[PDB]
Design a protein around this ligand. Sequence first.
Ligand SMILES: Nc1ncnc2c1ncn2[C@@H]1O[C@H](COP(=O)(O)OP(=O)(O)OP(=O)(O)OP(=O)(O)OP(=O)(O)OC[C@H]2O[C@@H](n3cnc4c(N)ncnc43)[C@H](O)[C@@H]2O)[C@@H](O)[C@H]1O
Ligand SMILES: [Cl-]
Ligand SMILES: [Cl-]
Length: 341
Amino acid sequence: SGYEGILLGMGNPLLDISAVVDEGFLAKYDVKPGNAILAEDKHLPMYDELASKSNVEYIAGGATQNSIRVAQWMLQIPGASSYIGCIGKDKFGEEMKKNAQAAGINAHYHEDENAPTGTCAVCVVGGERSLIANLSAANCYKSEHLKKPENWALVEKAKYIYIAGFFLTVSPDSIQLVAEHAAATNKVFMMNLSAPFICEVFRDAQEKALPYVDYIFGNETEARTFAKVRGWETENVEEIALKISQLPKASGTHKKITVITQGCDPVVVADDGKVKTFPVILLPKEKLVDTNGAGDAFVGGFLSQLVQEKNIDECVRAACYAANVVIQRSGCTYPEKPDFN
Ligand SMILES: Nc1ncnc2c1ncn2[C@@H]1O[C@H](COP(=O)(O)OP(=O)(O)OP(=O)(O)OP(=O)(O)OP(=O)(O)OC[C@H]2O[C@@H](n3cnc4c(N)ncnc43)[C@H](O)[C@@H]2O)[C@@H](O)[C@H]1O
Ligand SMILES: [Cl-]
Ligand SMILES: [Cl-]
């Protein structure tokens, strides 16, 4: 088939350890609700504390893995997706390999000899979660691994390449190597803003990669964080989307299209100097089960139609379908086959 390995993702493969907790649990580990952070030494016993709970759920996660997973599911073409990351030689790493084969992703996972597979605590309070990412083996990815002929073949075969902003903490040099290849080969390189701490702490790494980005995705909060960091005196998402697209580009082959989600409010898309708003699928609060992986599934649905050379209206329509499905189910899960027509 023509779509063989047409979409590649590179990131942090993390097994999510999710559980419903109370206010005291977050106060114990000093974690703010509805915010993502990287794990510190004080947060490490929390993983064993969550593992001991009766309501603990284990699901193969990681922002880029989730988006590639949802794109392959929406697309339904066998062998169309590829993924690159680092895992440990342990039970969680074998679960990561098992899940990727079931999902239909050609995941070339580099197995580190000493580090365990990365985990991510998803502490849930009401309808807001705190993510504490312990990258462990995921943080061991080197440009040396990407340059291996087995891994670099996936970069060359791909036409569309996606990397969540989270991977900028692990290897900005590996990101830059595939980004420079995509500019030189007129391919579609794309990224996510991922979290406010990526825009604030990793501002230099993100700024260096952005000129190579053809489709930048994000939510309203991380777009406002991005605007405040660059001194733009504006909170309006519509003005911020045009200002991001307006930034310099390493290659003028493609324009930069900025897609910003606003939860239940319309999707804002800056494209060729014009702002296009798209209302989302109306959903009652009783059916809204969990907003976990809503942003990652939105990117996945968008990528499924972008791969088939479809217009931006159909990319956003599939992005809303995929996110709508995921929010009505626990975590980033979906039915056997998609019903997008
Ligand atoms: N360091 C690290 N490295 C790698 N991975 C890491 C990591 N740290 C964490 N991760 C991974 O991250 C994952 C958890 O991420 P998670 O916290 O779930 O992020 P997300 O998937 O982006 O979900 P959010 O709740 O943040 O949504 P959003 O604000 O982006 O989107 P919006 O609400 O605008 O909504 C988007 C769309 O949803 C739909 N939608 C949302 N709300 C509604 C509504 N009320 N009604 C209708 N449609 C809605 C719409 O279509 C809308 O456009 C885990 O797998 C974990 O492993
Ligand atoms: Cl990632
Ligand atoms: Cl319990």
